[PDB]
A paper describes a structure:
Here, by deleting the branch-site adenosine (BS-A) or mutating the branch-site sequence of an actin pre-mRNA, we stall the assembly of spliceosomes in extracts from the yeast Saccharomyces cerevisiae directly before the A complex is formed. We then determine the three-dimensional structure of this newly identified assembly intermediate by cryo-electron microscopy. Our structure indicates that the U2–BS helix has formed in this pre-A complex, but is not yet clamped by the HEAT domain of the Hsh155 protein (Hsh155HEAT), which exhibits an open conformation. Thus, Prp5 proofreads the branch site indirectly, hindering spliceosome assembly if branch-site mutations prevent the remodelling of Hsh155HEAT.
Further classification and multibody refinement improved the resolution of the stable U1 snRNP region and adjacent U2 5′ region to 4.1 Å and 8.3 Å, respectively. Stem–loop (SL) IIa of U2 snRNA is bound by Hsh155, Cus1 and Prp9 in the ΔBS-A complex, in a similar manner to that seen in the human 17S U2 snRNP and subsequently formed spliceosomal complexes. An extended helical density element is located directly upstream of SLIIa. This element is longer than the U2 branchpoint-interacting stem-loop (BSL), which is found in the isolated U2 snRNP and sequesters U2 nucleotides that base pair with the branch site. A modelled, extended U2–BS helix—lacking a bulged BS-A and comprising 13 base pairs—fits well into this density element, indicating that an extended U2–BS helix has formed. In the ΔBS-A complex, the U2–BS helix is located further away from the carboxy (C)-terminal HEAT repeats of Hsh155HEAT compared with its position in the A to Bact complexes, and it is not sequestered by Hsh155HEAT. We find here that, in the yeast pre-A complex, Cus2 (human TAT–SF1) has dissociated and the Prp5RecA domains are located between the U2 3′-region and the U2–BS helix. Compared with their position in 17S U2 snRNP, the Prp5RecA domains in the pre-A complex are located further away from Hsh155HEAT, with RecA1 fitting well into the niche formed by the amino (N)-terminal region of Prp9 (Prp9NTR), with which it interacts, and the U2–BS helix. Moreover, Prp5RecA1 now contacts the U2 snRNA strand that connects SLIIa and the U2–BS helix.
Residue numbers in the entry:
A (entry chain P): 53 to 133, 144 to 305, 323 to 481
B (entry chain O): 160 to 971
C (entry chain S): 2 to 93
D (entry chain Z): 2 to 84
E (entry chain P): 882 to 890, 918 to 1265, 1292 to 1361
F (entry chain Q): 125 to 213, 239 to 291
Write the structure that this text describes.
RNA sequence: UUACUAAGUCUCAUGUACUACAU
RNA sequence: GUGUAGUAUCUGUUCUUUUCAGUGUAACAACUGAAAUGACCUCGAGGCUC
């Protein structure tokens, strides 16, 4: 008898286009004998992976790498004191640090060290889905949505060396939005928002962690309870000019906070709102913050659910004392973008979770901090600014779309 | 607070007692050290480990306890700084690396307990110890305290306390602490490189020669720690280092050369040539060292310079080759072990740069010399050069001279010199196709070394013949095969087991290079002669005999009567589970060819009949033989006869069948997929059988079979196999319960959770308090292996649970 | 272990280090003690390495091992490979 | 001895993998594990996350993700009720 | 190999977010688009045929705006061969009928509102039955005819208790149906004339959340999952014999002789076997995307083997090609088996050379095994994954020749031949 | 005590159930009966094999005494090793023969009985009689 | 035309295997 | 062809304080505590019995 047994041949004709992860490192040196430039980006969708360069002000396919056959749940580049190779975490729990290399006549992706963690599946205990690397590249940190957090201390030698994992386990605390604060080599410090899994009331509390290179463990530092409305954390780099004390930006829904590590300074600045507020209007939120610093001027870009792109700068408030202030303003906005990067060049790569990734070069850079009209301050935390969006697109200029 | 003394007895409970009972003492003392008294606590903790009875594990436990006490008693550890500094100092200077590591850890913990000011006030007045050992211990203690309490945290205090001119003691102790910190930190001297060089440069032009030597040693240690890159700070003292090479005298020039040897490889490419030319005025001139401290330093400096890319091979052949060959390349160091190692290493490192032919045609005299002492080192260096470079740089006259020297060294092997034995094979491999024209020389050498009838001599000759067997016999000669086989099978009854193993290895190499009947010993005679040799209990002898019997049936699978091969297989079946894994691998490697040459049906019937005999102490190995005989054509020749052996009514036989089926499946990953359906009617009577043993081992079959056959598309058969398993979940006993759990987990992979779930769900809670405890085991393992995999399969509906999830019903 | 019951395991997050097994225990998958088609080298937490105890056979806990232990292909699919740190703390 | 080890491995596996029904587990305890894992995978796969984002119609996708995160805790229902 | 397509399409953002896409049965390709507004409920309809779109009437606008109409689900129907109607289901739970017009050398689309009908359910799924609209309520399947002043219920079929809602459904030549669920899986129905009802004749094995569903054949069904499983099921030959040898009218009531086992499964397990048959799993696969649309094409660029191509939500398009003969799937299966553990083979070679003198995930770059990743939710059954064997093409000649030595079969060159054969010949 | 006496009647539990005939008297003491009825009565779940609540260790069966030891699958019985080796109270074979039996002859071959989605084997059951039954419904016709 | 189910626990005996241990 | 200790498994045999309450059990079982004595009526059951 003929066996039915339909034999199907699966092919991926066009590969998954929703880009969930990106990294800013400089991986391969191509077409140039000796060149080192930080401008390049590698972007990953789950299985599929791609590597783009710009260097021209216009984005370029470099090579579409072979199918990894896994779910990449986070990807972050690491830079150590060298060719910058990206640390990649996926299902199987393996922390896989891969370097993009030129082999034969094509670019192939080589793996250096993969460390077994959890098991093979997409899990809550699985220390993936939340990942970040020390901006100086000294240590990589993975965490889990709920159970536990692991942080490896990365060291380079004639062969790469991953230090033994540093474990912290909080049973009932569901972790969300890992954001690591840069440091001067003092000590790595990462910040999370822990929502309690088992509780009578909904409680979302931020928590700070300082990994101690001396004692080789992660230390709970400041546990600050904030309203359940909390959304995300971003890292303010220094505030060295104003008054180790890191400061974080906690995006809430209808307003923004920034908090000290020592709790000395908690600044509430209400996020402005559109003029139309069409039909259903949420309290919104900010989906993606990012930081940039040049010439003593550091501003951050935080975009709302409507796509409104905002900046923050810090003012000493010379009249009172030297103390931080927080100043919102308005930009060209954009469509909703999952993640934002900035080259050493003035190019700002906007990775949209919606449809298309597109790159910019900013010139106007936005309104000056002097104007009291359109800019909000931490002077009075209770205040509201209505603004009509601008389709004229003055501040940002689209260079390339994907 | 006398109970803290009893806590010392509790410390005994941490030492003498159970692991949890021992860790409980530390966990309790961690929350009680603050309420115990720093004085008595230290007075009871320090002498406990200070005694010589502190074992390795005891030392580790004491170190952990002291670290916990310091972490609890941070400020209280200040008054006790004079105690641990007097206790941890000698332990840090111990012989074993573990002792020094524990001492350094204890010192770092004591430093981190108090502040840097306490460590400074403790280590500063300790410089009055006029004893060199006490001074070195204090310097190492200060270095360890600075390596953990911050290098720049103690850098200014040390630079302000050592930059004075009190006496030579402080000036020496400063450089000593600097070198100790640079050695303890390691690669962490990059940022503090210039910060330390700024304070260490005060000794490069110091008046006292001792301070200058200490500064040179510290600079060399820093260059070795911060090597190879990062020579920027090295330029701060690079000029004096390159100038004073031929300026100091005795110890000063020695220290300068020792520092330059480390600074040269880390230097750049431009200034490296100038530094080498400036140092050669005092290096090549003083190549002949009156003592060993100068000779070893010069050898290390020459090796480091050869490693550097600055001085090319031309400069080495011009100004480095003649001096190195005159003052160093000689038999004047035939007894200095350290010198014999250092010169050999330097020559091996420099041969790759100066060309192997440049030394292969210049070292053909030290090996052929009558002095066996220097001849051993010469042969070692020659073998190292041949292994590093290879056989390219080999001239005709040079090759002839090397062959003559090797033959003279092997013939004049008056002592047990394994260097020549190890280098003969390397030289034969370097010969390659040239060994054919040089055949009769090595042939006569091996004949004279084999017919000598000396035990160690015959062993070395057999080893050298087995090493160079494939190069000589495989030269397409067909003339030396008989001359080799006649002498090979002659000394077959050697009482020495090592000589017997060497002869067996040589015969195996000959049989691999020779054929039937090209081999000199007849197959019909070597087979019965080698048959009783396999019965010997010698490890190496049996390991070689197994491979010999296997290779005997390689090209020629016949050369035997079937009864002889069957007897050999029956004899070797008992050695398939020996202690040494090499014999276990050789047995399986030989039995495959043995069964391929004998026949499938005969070997299968023999193995089946052997199942009932050889009761279950070594019976399972016979089953492995069934699984080892079904790897040449697959398990389609072993399985049918197995199934009949299961048709046999005897229990123990059926068990051996089911287990043999398990193992034969785990040894084949991709094979069982096609064989799965023929198995299920056998497991039909297995899983249904009343005996918990048959149900157990059948489940063990389903484990491997399901794991390796999972995803093939046989789930419909797997569904059956499971449907018979589910009723066995409630079966008790540890073996049955774990075999059945593992079986069901294997079924989770072949079926996927969904159906396996469906069973687990319909039994998931239940009132029975027993059924529940049983199924929640399977659901625990399922939750361990799969979570996301089970997510879609939770039978949860809005009426099933209150909250449910509002987002599952969303449809777009 | 799979056979001897009283043997206790470690089960922590494995580090970069690789566990050693003695020539006597060579070839066993540390979970199932199987000799077939090994896959990935065992990795143990740093807490099981440190000093002399690092040299011990992760299986028999007594002898000093030269060889690395590998998981089999059945345990690598069962995921017990990634379960945690295999070691035998109690001698049994 | 063997079962006694299975108790310890029950404690360890329960610690790592959180909810594992041992013998007696309340429907509130277990259903919470169900909800937590289902939401966990809905937000965990960028795929299903993108899906729930559109079918729900939220203005941004991270609203859906952090929604699921918040939805993991029981009090989030009353939290929505208090808005 | 990387692209296999070209995409023909200040800041530009449209307030209208698209909803669904439709095409007329009679016109071979005429594609009608329906969008929504983010804001007050609003819609637009943009029809295109041939090169670019159409004008609306004599107006400049190329699209139509529908105020207060939002579309939860929509499908176009032709009640008569000469008339073309459009079907909207509003979130107000109202069924709206329209009429499409093509002006033909004045050519333009003219949409015309006909009727208004209230609906109990949201109507997540509807399709074209013969002469009729075949729609699915939440619980039940209604078959609407064409009435005037509004459309009428011609027949209603009450679902088995298991089905809560119907995500999607599809028909086979008007005789048969496959009806999907949110929670539960596909269940096939048959239309019985003069019985005026669909009778379920088969259940499905396991619980699967089916987003989109199609027919390859009469007896087999394609389906995807909310979670990314791509599967295909087949009715058992025991059922195919019965339905081939019997009329549907005898299924619900009347004499149909079922083997002893089926009835014993009815009284023994009434919940699972209520539909008295079960789908034996035929093909199963996991594509990490969420498949939006399956389409079964009798030929892909004239190729003989008919393929099925799917577009995923996160975006992707992929195909399942049935392999003729056997040694096609034997060679393909062997190549996939090679590339599966190839990383482990490299690790064992790299291990042996270290015994005589590269991590484990070297070749895969990630720890996931192929069979493990592609298995995932449920093990792949007969489907061999070509996306793996394609990676064999990029590897260097040394690596490829290192891998193919495990086969007594043909050389690397013929391997690459068979691999590249699929895109050429099969599409 | 109070919780044991707090239990709702099984018929009170039937109304919550879409397929009430599966629920049984012992479901009254289900600690979460409203839930257990929903799970047990969910579509595709396969009720626990009923050999629990019996202390017979699942096999005391009198029928187990009369079960046949084994029967070769006829395709393997073609290989003739049955005559070569007598299992009931050496035989040279061909590699091509055995290999072809499993592959050439027996590729499409499958066991005749197997079992279905929810088939569960109770102690008193014997599949063989049902195999001859299914085969007989096939051969014999009016 | 008979619409398919019986032994259990205890006690004191018989039947039969077995496990460490010694000549 | 023996002895020491010990185990398992048949089969035979037999039904342990009538009740109450608690534990326990899926329900049993099992376990834990106490104790009615007297009178009458109908066909081992029965009593808004005293």
């Amino acid at each position: 008898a003929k066996d039915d047994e339909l034999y199907l041949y699966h092919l991926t004709l066009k590969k998954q286009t929703n880009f969930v992860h990106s990294c800013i490192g400089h991986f391969v040196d191509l077409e140039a004998g000796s060149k080192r430039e930080q401008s390049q980006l590698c972007v990953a969708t789950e299985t599929h992976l791609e590597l783009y360069d710009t260097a021209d002000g216009e984005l370029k396919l470099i090579a579409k790498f072979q199918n990894l056959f896994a779910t990449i749940t986070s990807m972050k580049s690491l830079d150590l004191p060298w060719p910058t190779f990206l640390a990649l975490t996926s299902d199987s729990g393996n922390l896989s640090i891969v370097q993009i290399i030129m082999h034969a006549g094509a670019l192939r992706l080589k793996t250096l060290v993969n460390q077994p963690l959890t098991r093979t599946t997409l899990r809550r205990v699985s220390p993936i889905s939340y990942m970040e690397i020390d901006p100086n590249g000294r240590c990589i940190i993975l965490s889990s949505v709920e159970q536990n957090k692991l942080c490896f201390l990365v060291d380079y030698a004639q062969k790469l060396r991953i230090s033994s994992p540093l474990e912290i386990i909080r049973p009932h605390m569901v972790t969300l939005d890992m954001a690591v604060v840069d440091v001067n080599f003092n000590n790595p410090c990462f910040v999370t928002l822990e929502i309690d899994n088992a509780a009578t009331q909904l409680s979302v509390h931020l928590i700070f962690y300082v990994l101690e290179l001396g004692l080789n463990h992660i230390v709970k530092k400041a546990d600050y309870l904030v309203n359940p409305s909390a959304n995300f954390v971003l890292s303010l780099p220094d505030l060295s000019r104003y008054n180790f004390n890191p400061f974080v930006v906690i995006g809430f829904e209808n307003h923004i906070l920034v908090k000290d590590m020592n709790g000395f300074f908690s600044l509430k600045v209400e996020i402005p709102k559109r003029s139309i507020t069409n039909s259903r209007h949420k309290n919104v939120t900010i989906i993606s913050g990012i930081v940039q610093k040049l010439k003593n001027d550091f501003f951050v870009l935080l975009q709302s659910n409507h796509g409104d792109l905002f900046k923050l700068t810090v003012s000493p408030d010379t009249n009172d004392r030297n103390r931080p202030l927080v100043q919102l303003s308005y930009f060209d906005t954009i469509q909703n973008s999952h993640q934002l990067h900035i080259f050493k060049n003035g190019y700002l790569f906007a990775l949209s979770e919606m449809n298309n990734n597109f790159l910019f070069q900013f010139e106007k850079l936005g309104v000056e901090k002097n104007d009291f009209s359109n800019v909000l301050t931490s002077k009075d935390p209770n205040k509201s600014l209505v603004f009509e969006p601008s389709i004229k697109l003055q501040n940002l200029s689209i260079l390339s779309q994907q | 607070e006398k109970k803290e003394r009893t806590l010392s007895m509790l410390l005994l409970k941490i030492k003498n007692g159970n692991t949890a009972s021992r860790r409980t003492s530390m966990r309790i003392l961690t929350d009680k050290a603050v309420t115990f008294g720093p004085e008595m606590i230290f007075n009871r903790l320090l002498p406990i480990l200070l005694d010589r009875s502190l074992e390795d594990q005891e030392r580790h436990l004491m170190i952990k306890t002291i670290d916990r006490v310091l972490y609890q008693l941070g400020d209280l550890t200040k008054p006790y700084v004079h105690k641990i500094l007097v206790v941890a100092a000698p332990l840090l200077i111990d012989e074993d690396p573990m002792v020094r590591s524990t001492g350094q850890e204890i010192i770092t913990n004591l430093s981190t307990v108090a502040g840097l000011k306490t460590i400074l006030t403790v280590m500063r007045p300790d410089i009055e110890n006029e004893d060199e050992y006490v001074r070195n211990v204090t310097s190492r203690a200060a270095a360890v305290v600075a390596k953990a309490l911050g290098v720049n945290q103690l850098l200014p205090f040390i630079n302000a306390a050592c930059h004075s001119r009190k006496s030579w003691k402080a000036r020496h102790t400063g450089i000593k602490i600097v070198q100790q910190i640079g050695i303890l930190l390691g690669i962490g001297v990059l940022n503090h490189l210039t910060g330390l060089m700024s304070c260490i440069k005060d000794c490069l032009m110091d008046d006292h020669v001792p301070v200058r030597i200490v500064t040179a040693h510290t600079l060399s240690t820093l260059a070795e720690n911060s090597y190879p890159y990062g020579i920027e700070v090295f330029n701060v003292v690079l000029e004096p280092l390159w100038k004073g090479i031929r300026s100091h005298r005795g110890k000063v020039l020695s220290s300068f050369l020792k520092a330059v040897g480390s600074m040269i490889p880390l230097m750049d490419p431009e200034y490296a040539g100038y530094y080498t030319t400036e140092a050669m005025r005092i290096i090549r001139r003083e190549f002949d060292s009156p003592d060993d401290e100068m000779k070893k330093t010069i050898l290390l400096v020459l090796q480091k310079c050869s490693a550097v890319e600055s001085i090319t091979p031309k400069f080495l052949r011009e100004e480095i080759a003649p001096e190195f060959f005159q003052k160093f390349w000689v038999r004047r160091v035939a007894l200095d072990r350290p010198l014999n190692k250092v010169v050999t290493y330097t020559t091996v490192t420099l041969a790759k740069k100066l060309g192997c032919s440049y030394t292969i045609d210049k070292l053909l005299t030290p090996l052929r010399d009558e002095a066996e002492p220097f001849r051993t080192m010469a042969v070692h260096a020659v073998t190292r050069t041949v292994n590093l470079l290879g056989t390219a740089d080999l001239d005709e006259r040079l090759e002839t001279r090397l062959i003559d020297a090797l033959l003279i060294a092997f013939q004049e092997q008056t002592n047990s010199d394994s260097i020549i034995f190890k280098g003969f094979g390397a030289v034969t491999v370097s010969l390659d196709i040239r060994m054919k024209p040089f055949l009769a020389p090595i042939v006569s050498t091996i004949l004279n070394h084999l017919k000598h009838k000396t035990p160690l001599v015959r062993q070395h000759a057999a080893d050298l013949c087995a090493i160079l067997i494939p190069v000589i016999k495989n030269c397409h000669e067909f003339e030396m095969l008989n001359k080799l086989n006649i002498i090979l099978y002659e000394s077959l009854g050697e009482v020495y087991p090592e000589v017997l193993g060497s002869i067996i290895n040589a015969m195996y190499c000959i049989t691999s290079v020779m054929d039937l009947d090209k081999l000199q010993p007849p197959i019909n005679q070597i087979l019965p002669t080698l048959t009783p040799i396999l019965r010997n209990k010698h490890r190496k002898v049996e390991v070689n005999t197994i491979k010999f019997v296997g290779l005997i049936g390689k090209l020629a699978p016949t050369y035997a009567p079937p009864k002889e091969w069957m007897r050999i297989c029956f004899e070797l079946l008992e050695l398939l589970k020996s202690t040494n894994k090499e014999i276990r691998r050789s047995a399986n490697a030989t039995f495959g060819f043995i069964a391929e040459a004998i026949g499938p049906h005969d070997v299968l019937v023999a193995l089946l009949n052997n199942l009932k005999v050889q009761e279950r102490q070594l019976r399972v190995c016979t089953a492995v033989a069934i699984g080892i005989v079904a790897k040449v054509c697959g398990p389609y020749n072993v399985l049918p006869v197995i199934m009949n052996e299961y048709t046999t009514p005897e229990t123990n036989v059926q068990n051996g069948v089911l287990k043999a089926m398990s193992f034969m499946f785990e040894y084949i990953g991709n094979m069982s997929k096609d064989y799965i359906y023929f198995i299920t009617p056998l497991l039909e009577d297995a899983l249904t059988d009343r005996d918990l043993v048959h149900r157990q081992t059948a489940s063990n079959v389903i484990t491997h079979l399901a794991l390796n056959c999972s995803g093939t598309g046989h789930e419909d058969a797997f569904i059956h196999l499971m449907n018979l398993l589910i009723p066995n979940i409630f079966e008790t006993s540890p073996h049955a319960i774990m075999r059945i759990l593992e079986g069901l987990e294997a079924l989770s992979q072949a079926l996927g959770p969904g159906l396996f779930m469906n069973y687990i769900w319909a039994g998931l809670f239940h009132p029975a308090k027993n059924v529940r405890k049983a199924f929640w085991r399977v659901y625990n393992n399922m939750y361990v292996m799969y979570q996301d995999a089970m997510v879609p399969f939770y039978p949860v509906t809005p009426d099933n649970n209150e909250e449910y999830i509002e987002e599952l019903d969303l449809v777009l | 272990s799979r056979h001897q019951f009283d043997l206790i395991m470690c089960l922590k997050q494995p580090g970069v280090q690789t566990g050693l097994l003695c020539e006597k225990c060579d070839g066993k998958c540390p979970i199932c003690d199987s000799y077939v088609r090994p896959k990935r080298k065992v990795r143990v937490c740093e807490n099981c390495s440190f000093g002399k105890q690092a040299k011990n056979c992760i299986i028999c806990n007594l002898n000093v091992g030269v060889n690395d232990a590998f998981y089999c292909w059945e345990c690598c699919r069962l995921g017990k490979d990634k379960d945690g740190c295999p070691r035998i703390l109690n001698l049994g | 001895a063997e079962k006694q080890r299975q108790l310890k491995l029950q404690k360890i596996y329960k610690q790592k993998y959180i909810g594992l029904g041992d013998e007696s587990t309340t429907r509130e305890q277990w259903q919470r594990n169900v909800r937590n894992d289902t939401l966990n995978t809905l937000q965990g796969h960028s795929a299903s996350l993108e899906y729930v984002s559109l079918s729900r119609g939220d203005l941004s996708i991270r609203d859906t993700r952090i929604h699921l995160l918040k939805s993991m805790s029981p009090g989030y229902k009353a939290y929505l009720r208090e808005e | 190999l990387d692209n296999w397509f070209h995409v023909h399409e200040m800041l530009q953002i449209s307030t209208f977010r698209p909803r669904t896409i439709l095409s007329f049965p009679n016109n071979p390709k005429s594609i009608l688009f329906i969008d929504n507004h983010s804001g007050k409920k609003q819609c637009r309809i943009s029809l295109q045929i041939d090169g670019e779109c159409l004008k609306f009437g004599s107006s400049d606008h190329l699209y139509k705006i529908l105020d207060d109409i939002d579309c939860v689900s929509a499908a176009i129907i032709d009640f008569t061969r000469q008339a073309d109607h459009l079907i909207i289901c509003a979130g107000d739970k109202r069924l709206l009928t329209y009429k499409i017009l093509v002006n033909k050398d004045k050519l333009s689309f003219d949409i015309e509102l006909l009727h208004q009908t209230e609906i109990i359910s949201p109507i997540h799924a509807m399709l074209k039955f013969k002469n009729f609209l075949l729609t699915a309520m939440g619980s039940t399947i209604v078959l609407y005819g064409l009435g005037k002043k509004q459309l009428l219920r011609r027949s209603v079929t009450q679902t088995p208790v298991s089905i809560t809602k119907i995500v999607s459904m599809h028909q086979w030549n008007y005789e048969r149906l496959a009806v999907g669920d949110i929670h539960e899986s596909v269940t096939l129905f048959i239309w019985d004339p003069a019985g005026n009802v669909f009778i379920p004749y088969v259940d499905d094995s396991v619980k699967r959340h089916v987003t989109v569903l199609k027919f390859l054949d009469e007896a087999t069904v394609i389906g995807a999952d909310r979670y990314g499983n791509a599967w295909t099921l087949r009715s058992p030959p025991e059922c195919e014999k019965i339905m081939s040898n019997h009329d549907p009218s005898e299924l619900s009531n009347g004499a149909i002789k079922y083997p002893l086992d089926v009835i014993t499964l009815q009284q023994k397990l009434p919940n699972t076997y209520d539909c008295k048959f079960k789908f034996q799993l035929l093909n199963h696969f996991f594509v990490n995307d969420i498949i939006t649309d399956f389409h079964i094409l009798d030929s892909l660029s004239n190729s003989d083997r008919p393929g099925c191509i799917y577009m995923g939500l996160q975006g992707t398009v992929g195909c399942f090609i049935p392999l003729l003969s056997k040694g096609n799937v034997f060679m393909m299966g062997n190549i996939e088996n090679i590339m599966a553990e190839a990383d482990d083979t490299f690790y064992l070679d790299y291990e042996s050379r270290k015994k005589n003198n590269i991590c484990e995930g070297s070749c895969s770059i990630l720890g996931r095994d192929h069979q493990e990743y592609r298995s995932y939710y449920a093990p792949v059954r007969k489907v061999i994954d070509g996306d793996l064997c394609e990676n064999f093409l990029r590897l260097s000649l040394n690596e490829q020749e290192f891998l193919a030595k495990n086969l007594k079969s043909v050389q690397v060159e013929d391997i690459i031949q068979t691999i590249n054969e699929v895109r050429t010949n099969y599409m | 005590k109070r919780r044991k006496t707090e239990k709702p009647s099984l018929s009170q539990l039937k109304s919550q159930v879409p397929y009430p005939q599966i629920i049984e008297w012992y479901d009254c003491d289900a600690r979460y009966p409203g839930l257990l009825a929903s799970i047990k009565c969910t579509k595709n779940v396969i009720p626990v094999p009923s050999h629990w609540q019996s202390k017979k260790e699942y096999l005391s069966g009198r029928s187990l005494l009369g079960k046949r030891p084994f029967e070769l699958p006829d395709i393997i019985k073609k290989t003739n090793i049955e005559q070569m080796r007598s299992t009931l109270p050496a035989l040279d074979l061909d590699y091509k023969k055995l290999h072809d039996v499993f592959f050439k002859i027996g590729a499409n071959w499958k066991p005749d009985h197997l079992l279905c989605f929810g088939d569960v084997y109770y102690e008193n059951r014997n599949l063989f009689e049902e195999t001859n039954w299914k085969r007989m419904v096939d051969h014999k016709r009016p």
